[PDB]
Write a protein that binds this ligand. Structure first.
Ligand SMILES: Nc1ncnc2c1ncn2[C@@H]1O[C@H](COP(=O)(O)OP(=O)(O)NP(=O)(O)O)[C@@H](O)[C@H]1O
Ligand SMILES: Nc1ncnc2c1ncn2[C@@H]1O[C@H](COP(=O)(O)OP(=O)(O)NP(=O)(O)O)[C@@H](O)[C@H]1O
Ligand SMILES: [Mg+2]
Ligand SMILES: [Mg+2]
Lengths: 557, 567
């Protein structure tokens, strides 16, 4: 499942580059596994006679050893060039898949993480893929070829002690390291998660740096980050201590077992039972074997470490008449936000909704917008349930102007093209007049105006006008205005709301406001209090009967 | 400049670990540079003698070669363990320095770049320090010892051709690689900057993902990112192609010059002019020299690459107050001919003259372009590049420190800045030494003591941008922060807009009662807030068009007449 995802990230070019890395590393392993027999033939030849044909043969063997070294050094440079070229090839498809994965996630899941967390999650996952790609193509065929060749030729020389101890080392190595690889993977995954938590805390402090600066308390903001970095260091030191203990125990086992083979051949050469050519062949195999053993040690650890951390990443990723009947909602089971709210709204009519901050005006309208789907009750559109409507169809029929502004760090043209991609440059400027954003500071507005992070190069009211302009480019049946014109003066506010009603005449408009101006101009007003509709009717009728609406009208005087 | 900054990042433990890495790498280089002489002596002892060589001396030499190999393999493992331990040691001090560097920057410089850019900037800079630490500890003493040793012993054997060509190789290598290292550093820095630009665009799409989702246009958001990644790939391929061309030219030079030395000693051994012991010593030197040459090639490139990219980071982030000034209890604001521009193209505020006094509530209004927020941001000390003068009790704003100004003036911003932490953390931002009972008293003052008919716990975790609380409930957190501070001037820039008439009027009354001797400046487009004030100021197109009582301005002023038409 996880390997399938990695194989899908590479294109036709990526497949070739991956198999070229696997081929080059396998071919190099065959060539270098011949080297110790060449040294053995050089060594014995030196002890013997030194005829004309013995010097010519020595020179030939010296060239073969040189070719063996050159082939291995050219293969590590070719693996490097192909590996980096494959990194470039895979990263574009990996990043685009991640962005499209985030687009398909629900609002609740999106809001629980952080951008700094999100960008660093891609960094950790992309690294794990790079690690896994390297370990297959490089640490599979290459070490097996070299370990098999070593045992085969040492068995051929009838040296049962060397071939036996060499086999014994691989057998103990694989058993011991796989018995501890699970502990290394857990400690590394736990460290990487704390690392993500440290990035979210840094990202959070930088986004609210203006608030931290004006309230001072550099002590408070830095202590929070210092405690996150201390948790990060302790988790890193735990992994460091275990991995270094494994490296030292694996090194100590190598000097005992391979050292025993070295002393056995030393005593063999002294007593006259073993030849110098065979002794040099054995010592050169001890040195040769270190590289494949290092690759097996990395293969076992990096596959269990990167597979564990990449498993966590994949898991994390995995004419309209509105009729709301007995709608009940809770964010957490502990506390009830909306209880049995029953409404019946009709096309072409402008409705108003008000109440205190805890009543749940935004929640109710977010459920109509399809932000949250875990609700008890029924919401219909022309006798069609919201549950039976797709998110794409609901986004076309209903347009929700959020309480908070979401301005993209790009041109004004990009911010308006978010509402409609096929919009002509003349059509976008027509929408600017409708949003009263055609002229700013007695100079015309250009669509190429670059807007900085959070659109803070524009005033609060000017940001609201960008969001209102996006509405004019869409074609909805239901329009929801959740305190979207609060930072506008009475002139701009009334001018834009009239433009919404004229351009969208057959539109069900739901307006959330705490001001008399917006409540008076509506067909019907609904008072939501502690999650339930306490009062309903015309604004003038509510002024007398309802206490909350009455007190709102007396603020004008 | 740069190296001093890196040396300061290491503590007493970091200094030891760094010099241990430098020592272990240098010691190992001496030991391994002996190895080709041991092989020469093995070869000579066997060569010629028909098994009449001393076996005891052969065994001793075989053990010395084995020790030389083991010492070198133990040194790379010790370097690894010390390097990773030094990475852990240095990263905490590096990250804390970066956060405190960002705190001391001005608002204009912080608004230039997104948090995704900020987090990735630390990633790039921390990597560059790691690279530079490795090159100075492992790529300086180790290759010089090995290159000097090789030339010295080959000169000792009177082999002027091998010693000459080996010197020729190093001389051509250093000249050719340093003549291209400038091109590599430029291409890599340009690639790393495009990488930061890609991270800012991803971070920007995720922060506005809800807006992208509800408007659809996955096409638009993905195409923006696809074009950023294509710019990233093209910049990477440019560097890849040049570095691989350098590697192939350096490799081809090595097979020509070191191949010439190999053939010369081959013909020397065939003709009988050179010994086999000397031939093996020369070939083993050819093999040995690859590792130091690789380290010199890395030293030249990685210092010019990492120093170039780390210079940009230091430049962007790195680039007269009264000592222990005692601010008065009661402060009067005197703004004389204040003029301000964000960019030289247009004037935002022109010659605005005000005189506000302690204990009095003033109102400020006008259109969106007039600059109410900008004017009050300048009083708050957001921007310092202004023409004119602003005084506090005949003390210039320029002569007041940022910490003293933040104590005397509290500015309630138009936008809410809620920290992703507990409610206690969000309120302790205003005062660190606040008692748990004192913080709950402030919650009543902000009408945030009870929510949803249940008492508020100070341990309530607030999510990203505090979006687990309503828009009005977020404003109450900001208002609660005011009650924990002790200011002389309070500025309310549309800070109660998302509150109903009950909460709004209840909180504003609580502000005036708790801070009686406070100069209050209120920005609003609503009649409710303008009527309740001692004096109203109309700002239009960057200048004060009208000043006086609300009733006097109601008739005369055009802007306030447009507001009065509600009923
Ligand atoms: N994401 C969330 N998780 C948990 N509780 C939430 C969340 N969003 C809102 N609430 C709570 O739900 C209640 C209603 O929130 P909301 O619907 O935003 O308020 P509102 O009635 O629109 N008020 P206002 O926007 O301030 O004018 C409050 O008690 C909030 O704290
Ligand atoms: N950072 C900035 N860079 C450039 N122009 C800016 C910046 N901030 C504000 N402006 C412009 O300066 C003018 C005044 O901005 P600002 O001080 O926020 O407005 P305001 O008078 O508070 N209006 P409003 O908040 O909408 O009721 C407008 O033309 C803005 O576009
Ligand atoms: Mg709301
Ligand atoms: Mg403003």
């Amino acid at each position: 499942s996880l390997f399938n995802y990695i194989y899908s990230l590479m294109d036709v070019r990526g497949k070739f580059l991956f198999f070229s890395m696997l081929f080059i590393t396998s071919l190099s392993s065959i060539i270098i596994s011949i080297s110790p027999l060449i040294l053995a033939k050089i060594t014995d030849l030196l002890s013997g006679s030194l005829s004309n044909f013995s010097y010519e043969y020595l020179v030939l063997l010296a060239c073969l050893y040189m070719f063996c070294v050159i082939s291995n050094k050219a293969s590590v440079f070719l693996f490097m060039i192909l590996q980096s070229s494959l990194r470039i090839n895979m990263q574009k498809k990996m990043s685009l898949k991640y962005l499209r994965e985030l687009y398909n996630e629900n609002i609740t899941n999106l809001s629980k993480n952080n951008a700094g967390y999100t960008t660093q999650s891609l960094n950790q996952a992309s690294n794990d893929i790079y690690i896994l790609v390297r370990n297959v193509s490089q640490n599979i065929l290459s070490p097996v070829i070299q370990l098999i060749s070593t045992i085969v030729v040492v068995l051929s020389t009838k040296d049962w002690f060397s071939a036996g101890v060499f086999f014994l080392y691989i057998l103990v190595f694989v058993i011991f390291n796989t018995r501890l690889t699970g502990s290394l993977a857990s400690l590394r995954k736990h460290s990487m998660d704390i690392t993500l938590n440290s990035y979210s805390l840094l990202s959070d402090t930088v986004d609210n740096m203006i608030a931290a600066k004006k309230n001072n308390a550099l002590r408070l903001i830095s202590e929070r980050y210092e405690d996150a970095l201390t948790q990060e260091n302790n988790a890193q030191k735990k992994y460091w201590l275990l991995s270094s203990k494994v490296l030292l125990l694996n090194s100590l086992l190598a000097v005992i077992l391979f050292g025993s083979v070295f002393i056995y051949n030393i005593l063999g050469v002294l007593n006259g039972v073993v030849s110098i050519g065979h002794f040099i062949m054995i010592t050169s195999y001890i040195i040769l074997l270190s590289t494949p053993v290092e690759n097996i040690g990395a293969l076992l650890s990096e596959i269990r470490q990167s597979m564990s951390s990449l498993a966590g990443f994949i898991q994390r990723h995995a004419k309209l008449n509105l009729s709301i009947r007995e709608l009940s909602f809770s964010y957490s089971d502990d506390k009830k936000i909306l209880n049995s709210v029953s409404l019946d709204l009709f096309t072409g009519k402008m409705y108003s909704l008000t109440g205190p901050s805890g009543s749940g005006k935004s929640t109710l309208v977010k459920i109509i917008s399809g932000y949250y789907k875990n609700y008890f009750g029924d919401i219909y559109l022309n006798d069609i349930s919201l549950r039976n409507i797709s998110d794409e169809d609901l986004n076309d029929a209903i347009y929700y102007l959020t309480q908070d502004d979401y301005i993209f760090m790009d041109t004004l043209r990009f911010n308006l093209r978010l509402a409609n991609y096929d919009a002509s440059e003349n059509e976008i400027f027509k929408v600017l007049k409708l949003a009263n954003l055609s002229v700013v500071n007695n100079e015309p507005v250009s669509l190429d105006t670059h807007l900085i992070n959070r659109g803070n190069n524009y005033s609060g009211g000017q940001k609201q006008r960008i969001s209102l302009a996006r509405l004019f480019l869409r074609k909805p049946a239901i329009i929801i205005i959740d305190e979207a014109t609060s930072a506008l003066d009475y002139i701009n506010e009334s001018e834009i709301l009239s433009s919404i009603r004229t351009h969208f005449p057959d539109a069900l408009i739901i307006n959330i406001s705490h001001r008399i101006n917006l409540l008076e101009c509506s067909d019907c007003v609904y008072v939501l209090n502690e999650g339930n509709i306490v009062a309903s009717g015309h604004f003038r009728d509510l002024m007398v009967s309802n206490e909350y609406i009455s007190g709102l009208a007396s603020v004008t005087e």
